[PDB]
Each structure stands twice: as C-alpha cells, then as structure tokens.
C-alpha cells in the first residue's frame, strides 16, 4: 500500500476525505507531532531537513510523493489515494521557513493541482505565551496580543519560536485538533534576525557572537592580568547565557579574535594552538586557553557605569550589552567580514584615532582631509595595496575594490640562477591553498620556469614561500604572471554595511567615524551622569552616618528602647530627622564602625566626595569640556596602543 | 619532487641525513607544529584524524608514502629520498594514542625496515607544569616530579594532556629542538579514562556526564518548584564547568534522563520535544526546556551537608561531587547501559527499597530472600519477561540474558478475520526500526499472512502497532514467528559492571545493594556529623552575642575608645573573655540587633540549638539508632515515589 513503514506515521481511518497528513521537520517537531496527534485520522511524515538543503527528486521527496498518491503528468489523479489535507508544519525562524518555501515551490512544480484543489494547508502554531501565574496565554498574532493583555484584572512576554518548545498535548490542542486548531489554505507562489545576527554595530564594530564572547570574558573576570582559563570555560558560559547554539560557532568566533593574522588588534589572547593561515584549525577548546587582551579592556571600560543599555538575553534570565562602550574605533580598526553581506577592511589605530580627533575639531571635514590621516586599510598580514583609487571610492561611496599584492622580492642565488621570495601575502588568503594552485599551474604547463616551490613559513622566520626559477628563465616575468593567475594578488571588495539605529545602513568613511565619536560623547556623558548620581547617593548616606556617629549615645539609646526594627526606623527619622535611607544605613551599621580612626575615615571621605560632585557637574555643565575629555581619553588609547603601519600603499 | 604542495610543510635543507619529518594530528597540533619548527630542516605532515579511523592505503596514508620516498617490496630503498627521521607526534589521551597505534601498526606492515633502520621516533612532550608564580616547571615523567617538587625553597599541580595546550615556541623548545628535545626510537609491535568516564558508580549509579548534569541543575537552583529553563542553560553550564566537550554529548545525556520510556524514574523533567521510541531526536536545546524532577531532589538531598567528597573540576576552577548522596538506589532503579561495556536493567523503586530494608535487617541475606522482594527487572517500556532463570543467574553471577517479549494480543475483527495488536514493546527497541523489519519480511516472502501493518502509536492511545492478518491465515502462529525473527522479542544481556572503590567491579545483585546501603550509612552519618559541628559553631557564637548584648553599654564603650579594629578585638577578649570568633562576631554585629525583641530571638535560638546538639550526639552515640534513620528515610522515599510494577514476569 501507500504506507512507508517506519518513516510514515500511519493512521487507522481509510477514507481520504477524513484523513490529513502533516509534513513536519524531524529534529524540529517529529517526535512531538507523532505523539500528540489523533492516529485514527492523522498521519505524520517527519522530513529530514539537511537532505532538504539547496534534480529535485531526492529520497525524502520520493517519500512525499509515494505517501500521497498521484505523481505528475504520469498518473495525475487527485481522486487517487489518501490525505485530502496536507499540512505543512515548520518553525517560525530562518531554517524553518526555508523548508516551507522549499515545500511550497516543489508542490507548485510537480503537484500543481494539489493547490488548485486546496489540499495543502500551512499550520498556525501559537505565537505568544503571556504569564503571571496560573494564568498563562495562547495567542496567534500581534493584534490579538494588544487585545488580551490590555484587559488583565490584577496586572511575562515570551515569543514562541520553534515547535519543539511545545509539549505534545499542547501541539495537539493548539495546532492540530480539528476543533481548536485553525489552519490555512495556500494559493500563491514563492529576513530580520538573519541580518540582526550578521552585520556589526557601527558603534563598537561587533556582531552578537563577538559581543557576547567579549562580554562573557568580562563577566567572568578573565582579565589580562589573571591567568588563562581553558576556552571551554568561555564557550560554555556564552553558549548557555547568551548564544544558545553549538559551541562550535562560538569557539570559532573566539579563536578568530585571537589570531595575529586575522585581527589587526586581537581581542582575545589565546595560548596553545589556534590554527594558521593555511587554515589549520585550533585545537580542542578543552585544551587551548584564553583571556582578554589589554586592548579589549578598552572595549569594555566603563561598561558598568551605566553607559550602554543592557537588554534581556534570549530567555530573560540574564542581561547583556546591546553594545559595548568601545573606547577605540573597533569597527574600522579590526574591520568586519564573515560569510555572505558585509566587508570592511582593518585600519591603523593611530590613524583612526587622529582621524577621529580631526573630526572632533571640525564637524564638516570631508573624506579628503580625513584621508590625510587614514591613508588606507592596514592589514595584520601586511603586504602591498596598489593605489589610492580603490581606497578613495570605498571611503566616499563605501564601495570600491582594493588591490592587495603580496610582498615579493627577486633574489639572485649564484651560478646565474634566480629566486622568487614571498615574505608576506594578502589578507584572508589561504596560503596553503595558494601554494597548491601555484603548483597546479606548474603541473599543467600553464606557467613555465618553476623548478621548485617551498613554503618555509615558520614562527622564527615569518612567512617564507620560496619559488625556484630555472637558469633558462626570467623571474621578474614569472612573478607578474603569478599575480595574474594566483591569489598572490587578491582584491578586497569594500562594502561598508553596518547596523545604524538598529537598521542596516551602508556608510562611507566619514559617516562611520561620525557615528563612533557620537557614541563616545554618549558614553563619557552617561558615565559622568552615573558617577555624579552614584556620588550624591553616597554623600547622602555619609550625611547620615556622621549625624549617627556624633550622637551614637542617643542613636543606640532610641534603638535599644524600640520594640521592632520598624519602630526603630521611624524613631530614628523623628529624632535625628534622617531620611528613610540614612535611617536604614544607620540600623545596618556595624559596631566596628564606632572605633576611633573610623569617624575620620568618614569625614575625609565625605570631604573629597563633595569635590568629586563638584568637578562632575563642572563636566556636564559645559559640552566642550566634555568633548575634550573624549579627545584626551582617545589620545591616551592611541599613545598606549598605536603601532606602525604594516601595509604599504604604493602609487605611480 | 616529493613535496605534496599545500599538505606538507617543506623544509629548505635537501640532504636526508639532516632532515626530519613530524607526523602530527591536524586539529591537535598541526598549526602549532608548523610555526614552532625549524624550517631549515624540519618538515610537518599534519594528518587528518577522522579519515584515519577504523584496505589501508587511504588518501592520507598515500601522502605519508609519497612524502618519505620508498614504497613496499615494489621500490623498497631506505637509501631513497628524504627524512632520515620520522617523528610521530600525538596527544596523551584516548584519540591521540589511537592514532599512534595506527601509525605504528601500519609502519610494521608496509614499511618494515623504517623501524630496522630506526628512522621512526615517538616524541616526548612535557607531562607536568608546576606553578607558584614566575617559577613554572616542565617535567617529562612522574619520577622527575617527586624530584623537583620536593626541593622548592619558599613553597599548582597541572597535567599536560594535549599538544594544543602548548604554544609554538614551547612546542619548539620542549618537544622538537634537537638541543633540548629528547625523542624515542621504536623497536616493538602493537585504558583508564575510557573506563573512568564510562561505567556508573555503584553508589549513586551515575556516570560523569550524568552526575555533572544533575549537579549543575542543582548548582543553578533549577528545582522542580521553579519554572523551566531552556536546556541550553544547563548544557552550557555543564560544558564550561565540568564537561569540556561538545554540547551535543551533554544534551543527549540530559535528553535521555528526561524520556518516560528510557528512564524508569526520569531524572530530568523536560518540556517540548524530547524525541521518541522510534528514535526521533529532541528539538534544539535553545527550544526545549528542562528542570529537576521531584525524585532527583532525592539524588541530591544533603549534598551540601558535607556527605560526599567534592573534587577539582577539569581546570581546578570549580568543585564537583565525586558522587551524589543518592538517597534512593539509583544504579539499580534506573539501571545503566550506554554504547560499548556495562548493562544493568531498571527495577521497581518499591521492590528495591524493600530489598534494601530486608538487608539492613540481616547482613547475610542471600539473593534468594532478596529476590522475594525484587522479582526481577522492571522496564519503563513495560512488556513481558520470560522466566526467572535469566533473572536468577544475572542476580547471582551478575550475568544472564533476560528474554523480553512485547505485549501482544490476538483480537477478532468480524467477518471471520483476525488481528495482532502490539500494546507495548521491549526496552530500548527502536519501534520504527522494528516496523520496518516486520514489513521487510512481508516484502520478501519470509513471512506470510500479513495484509496490513500500522503504527497507530500516539500519546492518547499509547503504543499501538497493528498487524492485519488475511482470512486464509492463522494469527497465533504468525505471532510466534514474529518473535522468532523480529525485535518483537529481544534479549537483555545482563552485565553488572560498575565503579567500586574507584576501580571497576562486576557485582551481583546483593553486592550492588550492600554497597548502596553502606553509602547511605556513610551519608546519614556524615550529615549528622556536619549538623553537629555546624550547630556547636553557631552556639559558640550565640554564647558570645549574649555576653555582648547583656553588657552592650560596656561593649560599645571599649569599642569606642579602641583606636583600631585590632585593639578593639583584643580589648574585647580581655574584658569579656570572648574567643577570637566571638569577638569578631560582636564587632560585626549591626546596631539593629540591639532592638527589644531581638535579644529573645537569640536566647530562644540558643536554647533550641542546645537540644539539637543533644539529639545529634544521641544519633552518633549509637549505630542502631543511626541505621533506623537510614531505614526510616528510605521508607519515606519509597512511600512517596514507589509505583506499580509495569513489566510482567511470567513462568511455566
């Protein structure tokens, strides 16, 4: 029969009219769909999702076809075989509508009249569960959520994202039960978190995996001045608190911020094997060790002085930075790439910072004068850029291809023979892979005069790729031909996209720098506001302890007579006119605070503290004094972390 | 030439005598070996390890051969081609000597005289790094460690386990540098953590992944009475603190303690999709939720009252239980299996506990009377066991195969036709996989009379596998034949191995129960000792506050005059004859403790506390009273968690 024994979940009823078949993603909801359903009349085909990747008749699709009845133009019949309803059931997120599109598109091609008869439904899982206690809620779209929330008689906001979040009987009751359910008929043919979780933030130049990694290292106090911890310690922390995906994705990101050759200003300081340019992998996370770099402390300075807004983590049990204070221009400094739609090259910290300071002095500076500071990108991997034309367009429109060329010299080697010697290569270029191509060319006859080819590259000798040229051969020519047909020259395709005000923008150089400096103003100002506010609160406490201490006799006295902590309280406010807070601070004071030299510690603290409040108001009172702060602090970062440029930009 | 461009790391020197080649595992140490080495004379072949799994000429081996020179009997020459030394370099652990064996064994087969000439060396990485500060240590075997430690003039114990733990220049200096290095020549042909990390502990019946999972849930306060948390939260915690391996291994274990059908007494209470009997997987860990079960609290009760020894986690930054107090017989209750060498079936909590209590009353009870309580295994999945012969041997020797048979009935279905109806199946049996086999038999002609076959199994209807038999056919026969040739009957192979006193033992029933009850005695006694010791300490403090409070006037007085916290201290011990601890408790007392009704809270606390100390000594004073405790507490667990037996053991 049409049964697929062991891949289909068969139903007892035999007339199609009655029967329905759910196409659900295996790992997603398979088991749970199979238990919750009504096996009198409901069938389940849990589809392998990884075989349904990017012919179209694959072992899985073959099952869909043999399960229904029908076929194509060869045996078409809708009046053939079972399931008068086919219900597509997939997750809300990226990999779950990816399948929904693929299942629809297919149907449209081979099973045209399944839609014409309208046997195909999409399922409608709940969308929100709202909480207080014994009063949780199932809602199915946003407009229903305004409705039921604005209603709640005595007065937790959780978005359903995957079907596996749901128990069976809940899947039954909400999504499949002919009674409560509510599906959807299909009629027409075949974006957010994909982007959110992909582009950097213009402000601290990080993507979510990175921010959370760096945040976690901070939250764990893995500072540069304390010993290494095994990477598994960072990865697990991040995985469980902020990034609920494979460790593999997290570790990879962390590894990469730790590579001298990937990052112009490495964010993680790792010990052990972190892979290579040839693309060797890092060793097991339980083996390599890692901590913050000194420079990263700068990415995180002041994060606790209320300078960035924190947001809920993915389950609402933690809090994470929507951004980092990032007190050096990280987006531009270490750049951003990845796999897919942004591409921004690295740059000199010195250059950048000056480039910032020169804006902070004149708001309407054009890329022109900005470029007098920022000559161009500067790669960790060094090497040569070809002109200022690629750079200029990329700084002006935010798009331009830069030509990177390796560093190569021609050396003699006696007996009239010659040698090509590659000291450094272009950024992101897999060296191994290039070596294998140069060699391939030799094999085929596509290039002529290579007698040998060695990758001597080692720590103590840096990059050394060595090409031996025969006697009967010019090397200077062979060299240009290598550029022409090997990664030895590679273009960098500039595409300065990034998150501005939440949404993705394509920024130019200047715009990138402007958005950064405004975030430093924001950050130093918010800091100042926090320090002030934290200082006043403490001084209001000190006001209170002084009063308390000067009159301890009396203080103890009223307390001793007072029956409960509560009457004590009000009895302190009436008698010493202390505020609620001072009264409580007093009550919570410990007898050890009564010793001789402590009273003075207190006066001396209040006295300096009053001055602190002073100079803080002095900053907030005047915006120029506050901007000088931003310049000063940035100048210092520059002096302590600025380095020589590594990449030569030549001209003609 | 013999160069492998892009897979070999070529060396500049050309005479073999000089040259050496390191065979190192890619992901393990590849990148780091390649940087640290001396590329004048050292070559690196980083081998793919997953292709070197369990022909023997594979793409990787082909490289080894083409890299050296030589071959087999076809072109043999040791005087051919480069590398007069081949250095095998692999990890210390399981997957790293696995490769070392495979590389040796191979050599022995195809490259016999490589060893005869002794070109093959094994490398000797350091083994320990000892710490204090600027004084860390590289040692190469245990005997050197006694030597250098027992020596240290002013007076951290870390075992090196993977090469990726090491930086390049360290790998260079310690392991590869002709100078310091020190290798090994090979001459002869081709166990601990594999076991440690595999068998349960007889005591709480857990393996390491499980204990750490359960421990973590406790350390995170994920109790039954607080809401679910996404599994990613447990997995990440465990991964980073205690189990530095893939999340995948951890999640799988956690998922399994949450399945009604896998665990007779589920340890995790999950919400969402946790897979099925047909072997559907759980949904993404960021989607499913989980917490402790009520029963698991029992596995963890008293863990903080110093009842088990804690040990360092894998990096020495955390502490974990070497065992759990486990106040119900978990090993035997939920059993232990896995993939590879132990196999113990589940059992009735009621039975077990009685079975324990009956021992706790007579030490020399034989399996005989023990079995009057514990009739046999009891599977979550229910069904039928075939006799007491399988059970008896397994309880006596610790080995015996038990015959599990599904629950099947034959029902009429009118018009003279019949039906086989499978309500429950044998334990661990993949239902889907069985369905696919029963069907396969029908396809081939190997079995006769099946007209249909359905897996109606659903939540609301439990297991329902339905086999339709034709008119011209006997079903009672067809049924026996199904047992004969399908998982419908499956044997359970009993093999009661477990960790006793650290090392693995094969225990029998009685021995298993004895070791448990002794651990409960240990656990209730240690608890009692902790309560006592914690009670005395607090009473010694209360002794002090009373003195302090009765004379507050004087107390405040001496404190007020005393110049520093230190003189305050000694001035309190001289004047009120308080002990160091009482003096400090006093100094740390807060003024709010001086109110009216607080003095009495203190007297009343001391007074009940004195009684507590009383009854605690009363327990430790007499071992029978302490054993009754163990019986009482176990009786209660039994009453609140005991359930009806699910699996029928028939006889003849």
Curated annotation (Swiss-Prot), chains A, B:
GO molecular function term, any single one = DNA negative supercoiling activity
Query: What's the catalysed reaction?
Result: ATP-dependent breakage, passage and rejoining of double-stranded DNA
Keywords, in A-Z order = Antibiotic resistance, ATP-binding, Cytoplasm, DNA-binding, Isomerase, Nucleotide-binding, Topoisomerase
Cellular compartment(s): Cytoplasm
Q: Which family does it belong to?
A: Belongs to the type II topoisomerase GyrA/ParC subunit family.
EC class name: isomerase
Q: What Enzyme Commission number(s) does the record list for this chain?
A: 5.6.2.2
Positions of the catalytic residues? 287
Quaternary organization: Heterotetramer, composed of two GyrA and two GyrB chains. In the heterotetramer, GyrA contains the active site tyrosine that forms a transient covalent intermediate with DNA, while GyrB binds cofactors and catalyzes ATP hydrolysis.
Q: GO cellular component terms?
A: chromosome; cytoplasm; DNA topoisomerase type II (double strand cut, ATP-hydrolyzing) complex
Q: Which residues of the full protein are shown?
A: 27 to 491 of 889
Q: What does the further note read?
A: Few gyrases are as efficient as E.coli at forming negative supercoils. Not all organisms have 2 type II topoisomerases; in organisms with a single type II topoisomerase this enzyme also has to decatenate newly replicated chromosomes.
What does this protein do, in the record's words?
A type II topoisomerase that negatively supercoils closed circular double-stranded (ds) DNA in an ATP-dependent manner to modulate DNA topology and maintain chromosomes in an underwound state. Negative supercoiling favors strand separation, and DNA replication, transcription, recombination and repair, all of which involve strand separation. Also able to catalyze the interconversion of other topological isomers of dsDNA rings, including catenanes and knotted rings. Type II topoisomerases break and join 2 DNA strands simultaneously in an ATP-dependent manner.
Name of protein: DNA gyrase subunit A
The alphabetized list of GO BP terms reads: DNA topological change; DNA-templated DNA replication; response to antibiotic
Domain Topo IIA-type catalytic span(s) in chain numbering: 199-652
Asked if the Swiss-Prot or TrEMBL record annotates the protein with the keyword Kinase, the reply is no
